[PDB]
Amino acid sequence: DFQETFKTSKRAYFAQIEKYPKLKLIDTFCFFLVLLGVIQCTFIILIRDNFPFNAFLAGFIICVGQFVLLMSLRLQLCNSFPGISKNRAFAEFIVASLILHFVCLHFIN
């Protein structure tokens, strides 16, 4: 059952990431964006304190936000939406990313 769908999906996935090179860049980025969030959470646990809560959140949310924007890009890039082309779906991504980076550099103070 599950142990079979596992190989099936792994096959499909690696096939796609090899066929299209760019769909690996985003994936690598997303993987590391997880790690950084985990590192921050581990810090919060290792010290059992979250004194700069503004700072902690500004550092965790920039990762969550970048992850979700990358996934929106990967979905708009694997199968384009009706009125948005691959280009416009990269410029929109850039604008949203820049806005996120600003509000996050304003939150940490």
Binding site: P21, K24, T28, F32, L35, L36, I39, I47, D49, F51
Partner: protein, 57 residues
């Protein structure tokens, strides 16, 4: 005997400044994050292929 004698002194009691972690631990974690960024930047250029083929001309 109200308000006829010297009065006991009052002194405000303040709170405590929140404890900041010792700089060694913070330095260790900063190093971990820097190593993670480097590992990403090299995973792109090594295991993954960021081809840099189509540089505009």
């Amino acid at each position: 005997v109200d308000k006829f004698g010297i009065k006991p002194e009052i002194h405000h009691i303040f709170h405590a400044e929140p404890k900041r972690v010792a700089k060694p631990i913070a330095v260790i974690f900063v190093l971990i994050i820097f190593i993670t960024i480097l590992s990403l930047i090299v995973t792109w250029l090594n295991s993954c292929a960021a081809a840099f083929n189509n540089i505009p001309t």
